[PDB]
Amino acid sequence: ADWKVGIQTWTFHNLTLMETLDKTQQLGMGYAEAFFFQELGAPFPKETYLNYDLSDDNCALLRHEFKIRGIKPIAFGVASYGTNEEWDKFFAFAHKIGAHIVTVEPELNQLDYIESLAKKYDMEVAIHNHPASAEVVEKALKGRSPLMGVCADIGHWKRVGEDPLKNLQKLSGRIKVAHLKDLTDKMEDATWGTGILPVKAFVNELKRQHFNGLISIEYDDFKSDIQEIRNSLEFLQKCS
Amino acid sequence: ADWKVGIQTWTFHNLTLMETLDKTQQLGMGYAEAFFFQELGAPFPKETYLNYDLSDDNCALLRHEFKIRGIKPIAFGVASYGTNEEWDKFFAFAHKIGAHIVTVEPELNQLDYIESLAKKYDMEVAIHNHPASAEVVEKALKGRSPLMGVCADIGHWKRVGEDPLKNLQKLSGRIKVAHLKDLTDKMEDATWGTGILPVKAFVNELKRQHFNGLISIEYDDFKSDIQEIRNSLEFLQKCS
Amino acid sequence: ADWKVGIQTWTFHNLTLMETLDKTQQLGMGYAEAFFFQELGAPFPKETYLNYDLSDDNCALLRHEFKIRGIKPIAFGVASYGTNEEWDKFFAFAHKIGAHIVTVEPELNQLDYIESLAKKYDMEVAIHNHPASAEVVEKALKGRSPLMGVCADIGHWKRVGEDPLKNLQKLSGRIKVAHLKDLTDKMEDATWGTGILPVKAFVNELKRQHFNGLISIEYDDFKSDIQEIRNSLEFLQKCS
């Protein structure tokens, strides 16, 4: 309803992408943010990896493989390329596979060129700065197309006065993607700052800020299991 | 004797608190620093988690469950609340369960209110700053009640000139809790700075600084086992 | 041929050093950078650990144990000692075991003394600064013996404008060791910045900069297996 909940395929980077999508089905999510150079896996032939050089046949097969699992290949990233050729090929590929967003970590001088590509392919762009910070992204984005947005990192939720969502300030509306790293059961943490379940408080804040972008989750798949993460996904999804 | 050695229950956050306390028994420790929102586990009913809203009956049961295992619920934290109501409820709960310390990560404007609660409940407070640093805590604490102290993080022990214990400076005496994160066998590390076993050198420094607070240990329970950690606990405990 | 590829024994710090060397054989590497206080393991007696106090007999046995596995004990580190006695003993030990390099994290005032030891034992020194940065190492090293070099950390390869190799600048030639932390399959990462396999691009850059030092790799042995790492080692080694 309000926002989308997807998985960062990096979560399962030790698996093939097809296996990752099978896990995504077991988690009960309908969206993915895929990182490049993951082995695709059957039905793709061995040693074929995710990259913008995939043949038209393999691009069509990749689209089909997402579709039959009920998962949209909504995003690719994080891309941090150094040449215009790479950016061009990356945006063309994203468009060809049918992504609606790309997450990117560019230099400031690359933004002009990247914006032209966003327009050319009707691709939304969520900029991730290098992990002074909040001021630069707002200053850089001011006056640029609405396609040019922000990939916001949700750090360690929640600590008093370090609320990543409350930093949205003047660009709350340009926030297109939220990265949840190391998602835990009910967003529990060694440090907490909420009277209610942290994941409930998190969802409430997203509602209050009318976030309608993509919540892209990552977790440590060696330290957590599908059942544990499904506890958190419950609140992240059933609100929407 | 000199100091206390306890566990951070975050170590086993993938388990229930009762299971965590069973592990704490196998480790041979008599103290715990508990984080909120962990499932309690039997004898508590399913879906009951650690938080300051526990009924008087459940508070009494929690006290009993610690006591029969020979473990004191000495600390709760790290709390980083944003409202006075939350702080009030947290300190009341700590007192009700019989904690002697709480670890906290507040803003500077909250210290006055937090100090009033420390006095009101005779609760000691170990302040953890956001992970300029050493100066602020000393300046903030100067002239405040002896209950207002510091939760010191022991980073990567030991590197020349970056000794966290030697930073104690003028507030060595206000150091109430030391957090050991990612405890390894004999405190071995990829970088070392001692001629003797690092854990032996660490213990010696604690003796030299007359540390008599709580050493609160955390480790990666997926990368280490009880036997390995018991090697380090040996020196941390048998000195005292 | 061009450079050496070795393992950081920290990778397997949960094992004995002998077991670590067995794993190093299974990986197919001929060099090691060993951290101190690891249990040695059979044929050494129980509770004997790696440190500069090993008897001449045990030093000779350690040399033999490396040799029969086809692995050179090329480096020890990272050492971050606080006294001259410790440094002296560490360099003497490195020489006695037949290391050609030591990785170290000293204060600036210790460099003079450390350089004297490097000369005295013909030991190369790779300085690792505390993890303003690039300027200090160049300024500190200027005019010092060619034995005094740099241990460079390869962070998260590869992001545009944050290329650790391109920072080599004026001291490319004093770079003696490159630390690869958390090595992944084909150096894949959640953020990428290359059109080709990241490990291929990495190797190409090392060739272009004529790096001929030691690539010292570490990985998470709980999250990766020998087969996965052998995929990356393939390109790191077969280029040379």
PDB file of C-alpha atoms in Angstrom, chain C residues 59-215:
ATOM      1  CA  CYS C  59      61.865 -21.798  16.471  1.00  0.00           C
ATOM      2  CA  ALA C  60      63.653 -24.504  14.473  1.00  0.00           C
ATOM      3  CA  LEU C  61      60.563 -26.710  14.614  1.00  0.00           C
ATOM      4  CA  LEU C  62      58.362 -23.810  13.472  1.00  0.00           C
ATOM      5  CA  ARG C  63      60.660 -23.204  10.481  1.00  0.00           C
ATOM      6  CA  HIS C  64      60.521 -26.917   9.611  1.00  0.00           C
ATOM      7  CA  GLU C  65      56.707 -27.020   9.860  1.00  0.00           C
ATOM      8  CA  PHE C  66      56.354 -24.123   7.400  1.00  0.00           C
ATOM      9  CA  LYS C  67      58.949 -25.612   5.041  1.00  0.00           C
ATOM     10  CA  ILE C  68      57.422 -29.112   4.740  1.00  0.00           C
ATOM     11  CA  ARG C  69      54.095 -27.485   3.747  1.00  0.00           C
ATOM     12  CA  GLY C  70      55.663 -25.302   1.034  1.00  0.00           C
ATOM     13  CA  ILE C  71      54.665 -22.095   2.843  1.00  0.00           C
ATOM     14  CA  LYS C  72      57.107 -19.263   3.668  1.00  0.00           C
ATOM     15  CA  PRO C  73      56.678 -17.497   7.035  1.00  0.00           C
ATOM     16  CA  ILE C  74      57.183 -14.263   5.125  1.00  0.00           C
ATOM     17  CA  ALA C  75      55.549 -11.833   7.554  1.00  0.00           C
ATOM     18  CA  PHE C  76      54.516 -11.294  11.132  1.00  0.00           C
ATOM     19  CA  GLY C  77      52.111  -8.617  12.319  1.00  0.00           C
ATOM     20  CA  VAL C  78      50.365  -6.464  13.031  1.00  0.00           C
ATOM     21  CA  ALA C  79      52.608  -5.465  15.936  1.00  0.00           C
ATOM     22  CA  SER C  80      51.781  -2.288  17.858  1.00  0.00           C
ATOM     23  CA  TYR C  81      54.161  -2.480  20.819  1.00  0.00           C
ATOM     24  CA  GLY C  82      54.753   0.229  23.403  1.00  0.00           C
ATOM     25  CA  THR C  83      58.356  -0.471  24.476  1.00  0.00           C
ATOM     26  CA  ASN C  84      61.765  -0.760  22.829  1.00  0.00           C
ATOM     27  CA  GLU C  85      62.376  -4.140  24.477  1.00  0.00           C
ATOM     28  CA  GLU C  86      59.257  -5.570  22.803  1.00  0.00           C
ATOM     29  CA  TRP C  87      60.216  -4.192  19.385  1.00  0.00           C
ATOM     30  CA  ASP C  88      63.734  -5.579  19.752  1.00  0.00           C
ATOM     31  CA  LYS C  89      62.471  -9.052  20.707  1.00  0.00           C
ATOM     32  CA  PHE C  90      59.881  -8.998  17.888  1.00  0.00           C
ATOM     33  CA  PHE C  91      62.443  -8.140  15.172  1.00  0.00           C
ATOM     34  CA  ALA C  92      64.911 -10.713  16.551  1.00  0.00           C
ATOM     35  CA  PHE C  93      62.175 -13.361  16.439  1.00  0.00           C
ATOM     36  CA  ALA C  94      61.062 -12.431  12.910  1.00  0.00           C
ATOM     37  CA  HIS C  95      64.683 -12.760  11.774  1.00  0.00           C
ATOM     38  CA  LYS C  96      65.158 -16.050  13.627  1.00  0.00           C
ATOM     39  CA  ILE C  97      62.082 -17.598  11.957  1.00  0.00           C
ATOM     40  CA  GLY C  98      63.180 -16.172   8.601  1.00  0.00           C
ATOM     41  CA  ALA C  99      60.483 -13.602   7.919  1.00  0.00           C
ATOM     42  CA  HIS C 100      61.319 -10.936   5.328  1.00  0.00           C
ATOM     43  CA  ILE C 101      58.592  -8.466   6.363  1.00  0.00           C
ATOM     44  CA  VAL C 102      56.870  -7.293   9.510  1.00  0.00           C
ATOM     45  CA  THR C 103      53.641  -5.296   9.549  1.00  0.00           C
ATOM     46  CA  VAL C 104      53.499  -2.707  12.317  1.00  0.00           C
ATOM     47  CA  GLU C 105      51.341   0.075  13.769  1.00  0.00           C
ATOM     48  CA  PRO C 106      53.709   2.347  15.713  1.00  0.00           C
ATOM     49  CA  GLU C 107      53.675   5.917  16.955  1.00  0.00           C
ATOM     50  CA  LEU C 108      55.712   8.471  14.996  1.00  0.00           C
ATOM     51  CA  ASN C 109      58.295   8.757  17.816  1.00  0.00           C
ATOM     52  CA  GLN C 110      59.008   4.999  17.523  1.00  0.00           C
ATOM     53  CA  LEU C 111      59.941   5.137  13.812  1.00  0.00           C
ATOM     54  CA  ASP C 112      63.600   6.063  14.402  1.00  0.00           C
ATOM     55  CA  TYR C 113      64.114   3.102  16.738  1.00  0.00           C
ATOM     56  CA  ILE C 114      62.134   0.770  14.465  1.00  0.00           C
ATOM     57  CA  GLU C 115      64.237   1.835  11.455  1.00  0.00           C
ATOM     58  CA  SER C 116      67.434   0.949  13.366  1.00  0.00           C
ATOM     59  CA  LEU C 117      66.031  -2.541  13.959  1.00  0.00           C
ATOM     60  CA  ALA C 118      65.011  -2.901  10.297  1.00  0.00           C
ATOM     61  CA  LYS C 119      68.625  -2.118   9.318  1.00  0.00           C
ATOM     62  CA  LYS C 120      70.120  -4.310  12.059  1.00  0.00           C
ATOM     63  CA  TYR C 121      68.090  -7.361  10.956  1.00  0.00           C
ATOM     64  CA  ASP C 122      67.680  -6.507   7.240  1.00  0.00           C
ATOM     65  CA  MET C 123      63.920  -6.687   7.911  1.00  0.00           C
ATOM     66  CA  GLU C 124      61.416  -4.874   5.754  1.00  0.00           C
ATOM     67  CA  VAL C 125      58.762  -2.889   7.608  1.00  0.00           C
ATOM     68  CA  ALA C 126      55.227  -2.218   6.370  1.00  0.00           C
ATOM     69  CA  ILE C 127      53.650   0.554   8.434  1.00  0.00           C
ATOM     70  CA  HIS C 128      49.893   0.407   9.004  1.00  0.00           C
ATOM     71  CA  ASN C 129      48.384   3.721  10.198  1.00  0.00           C
ATOM     72  CA  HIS C 130      45.462   3.783  12.695  1.00  0.00           C
ATOM     73  CA  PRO C 131      42.179   2.696  11.010  1.00  0.00           C
ATOM     74  CA  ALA C 132      45.736  13.769   7.119  1.00  0.00           C
ATOM     75  CA  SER C 133      46.205  10.007   6.583  1.00  0.00           C
ATOM     76  CA  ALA C 134      48.046   9.829   3.236  1.00  0.00           C
ATOM     77  CA  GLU C 135      50.143  12.938   3.976  1.00  0.00           C
ATOM     78  CA  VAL C 136      51.565  11.717   7.313  1.00  0.00           C
ATOM     79  CA  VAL C 137      52.914   8.374   6.043  1.00  0.00           C
ATOM     80  CA  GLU C 138      54.640  10.063   3.075  1.00  0.00           C
ATOM     81  CA  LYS C 139      56.043  12.827   5.300  1.00  0.00           C
ATOM     82  CA  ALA C 140      57.158  10.322   7.959  1.00  0.00           C
ATOM     83  CA  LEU C 141      58.827   7.961   5.456  1.00  0.00           C
ATOM     84  CA  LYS C 142      60.578  10.630   3.329  1.00  0.00           C
ATOM     85  CA  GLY C 143      64.348  10.142   3.540  1.00  0.00           C
ATOM     86  CA  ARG C 144      64.125   6.879   5.515  1.00  0.00           C
ATOM     87  CA  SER C 145      65.729   3.594   4.409  1.00  0.00           C
ATOM     88  CA  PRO C 146      63.987   1.669   1.591  1.00  0.00           C
ATOM     89  CA  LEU C 147      63.208  -1.024   4.206  1.00  0.00           C
ATOM     90  CA  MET C 148      60.654   1.381   5.758  1.00  0.00           C
ATOM     91  CA  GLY C 149      57.446   0.969   3.767  1.00  0.00           C
ATOM     92  CA  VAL C 150      53.654   0.894   3.920  1.00  0.00           C
ATOM     93  CA  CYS C 151      51.040  -1.759   4.674  1.00  0.00           C
ATOM     94  CA  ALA C 152      48.118  -0.571   2.550  1.00  0.00           C
ATOM     95  CA  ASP C 153      44.540  -1.535   3.398  1.00  0.00           C
ATOM     96  CA  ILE C 154      42.356  -2.331   0.412  1.00  0.00           C
ATOM     97  CA  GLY C 155      38.987  -1.232   1.760  1.00  0.00           C
ATOM     98  CA  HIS C 156      35.825  -1.932  -0.214  1.00  0.00           C
ATOM     99  CA  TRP C 157      36.919  -2.431  -3.800  1.00  0.00           C
ATOM    100  CA  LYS C 158      35.874  -0.607  -5.938  1.00  0.00           C
ATOM    101  CA  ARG C 159      34.123   2.768  -5.545  1.00  0.00           C
ATOM    102  CA  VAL C 160      34.632   5.799  -7.804  1.00  0.00           C
ATOM    103  CA  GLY C 161      37.238   8.195  -6.370  1.00  0.00           C
ATOM    104  CA  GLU C 162      37.996   6.004  -3.326  1.00  0.00           C
ATOM    105  CA  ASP C 163      40.524   3.708  -5.011  1.00  0.00           C
ATOM    106  CA  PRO C 164      43.104   2.738  -2.335  1.00  0.00           C
ATOM    107  CA  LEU C 165      45.706   1.793  -4.956  1.00  0.00           C
ATOM    108  CA  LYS C 166      45.481   5.188  -6.720  1.00  0.00           C
ATOM    109  CA  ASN C 167      46.372   6.866  -3.391  1.00  0.00           C
ATOM    110  CA  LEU C 168      49.861   5.299  -3.772  1.00  0.00           C
ATOM    111  CA  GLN C 169      50.857   8.672  -5.313  1.00  0.00           C
ATOM    112  CA  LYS C 170      54.548   9.415  -4.529  1.00  0.00           C
ATOM    113  CA  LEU C 171      55.182   6.351  -2.328  1.00  0.00           C
ATOM    114  CA  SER C 172      54.116   3.744  -4.928  1.00  0.00           C
ATOM    115  CA  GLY C 173      57.351   1.793  -4.569  1.00  0.00           C
ATOM    116  CA  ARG C 174      57.274   1.986  -0.773  1.00  0.00           C
ATOM    117  CA  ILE C 175      54.036  -0.086  -0.760  1.00  0.00           C
ATOM    118  CA  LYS C 176      55.247  -3.455   0.544  1.00  0.00           C
ATOM    119  CA  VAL C 177      52.032  -5.150   1.718  1.00  0.00           C
ATOM    120  CA  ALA C 178      48.377  -4.921   0.692  1.00  0.00           C
ATOM    121  CA  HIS C 179      45.795  -6.154   3.213  1.00  0.00           C
ATOM    122  CA  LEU C 180      42.658  -7.591   1.643  1.00  0.00           C
ATOM    123  CA  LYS C 181      40.054  -7.847   4.391  1.00  0.00           C
ATOM    124  CA  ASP C 182      36.848  -9.891   4.027  1.00  0.00           C
ATOM    125  CA  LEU C 183      37.798 -11.291   0.643  1.00  0.00           C
ATOM    126  CA  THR C 184      34.748 -12.424  -1.317  1.00  0.00           C
ATOM    127  CA  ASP C 185      34.181 -14.631  -4.346  1.00  0.00           C
ATOM    128  CA  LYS C 186      35.627 -12.704  -7.331  1.00  0.00           C
ATOM    129  CA  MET C 187      35.845  -9.640  -5.017  1.00  0.00           C
ATOM    130  CA  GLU C 188      32.130  -9.124  -5.463  1.00  0.00           C
ATOM    131  CA  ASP C 189      30.628  -6.466  -3.225  1.00  0.00           C
ATOM    132  CA  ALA C 190      27.278  -4.825  -2.443  1.00  0.00           C
ATOM    133  CA  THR C 191      28.810  -1.734  -4.072  1.00  0.00           C
ATOM    134  CA  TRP C 192      30.810  -2.191  -7.290  1.00  0.00           C
ATOM    135  CA  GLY C 193      32.497   0.155  -9.754  1.00  0.00           C
ATOM    136  CA  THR C 194      33.884  -2.015 -12.541  1.00  0.00           C
ATOM    137  CA  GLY C 195      32.448  -3.309 -15.817  1.00  0.00           C
ATOM    138  CA  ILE C 196      34.524  -6.497 -15.554  1.00  0.00           C
ATOM    139  CA  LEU C 197      34.860  -8.966 -12.642  1.00  0.00           C
ATOM    140  CA  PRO C 198      36.124  -6.843  -9.720  1.00  0.00           C
ATOM    141  CA  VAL C 199      39.021  -9.204  -8.990  1.00  0.00           C
ATOM    142  CA  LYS C 200      40.111  -8.961 -12.655  1.00  0.00           C
ATOM    143  CA  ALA C 201      40.021  -5.153 -12.471  1.00  0.00           C
ATOM    144  CA  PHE C 202      41.956  -5.279  -9.196  1.00  0.00           C
ATOM    145  CA  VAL C 203      44.680  -7.480 -10.665  1.00  0.00           C
ATOM    146  CA  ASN C 204      44.905  -5.197 -13.720  1.00  0.00           C
ATOM    147  CA  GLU C 205      45.503  -2.191 -11.456  1.00  0.00           C
ATOM    148  CA  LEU C 206      48.197  -3.996  -9.513  1.00  0.00           C
ATOM    149  CA  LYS C 207      49.868  -4.795 -12.861  1.00  0.00           C
ATOM    150  CA  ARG C 208      49.540  -1.173 -13.992  1.00  0.00           C
ATOM    151  CA  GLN C 209      51.106   0.104 -10.746  1.00  0.00           C
ATOM    152  CA  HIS C 210      53.794  -2.610 -10.951  1.00  0.00           C
ATOM    153  CA  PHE C 211      52.995  -3.775  -7.435  1.00  0.00           C
ATOM    154  CA  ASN C 212      55.539  -6.420  -6.463  1.00  0.00           C
ATOM    155  CA  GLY C 213      54.951  -6.728  -2.718  1.00  0.00           C
ATOM    156  CA  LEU C 214      52.767  -9.079  -0.708  1.00  0.00           C
ATOM    157  CA  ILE C 215      48.998  -9.334  -1.123  1.00  0.00           C
TER     158      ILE C 215
END
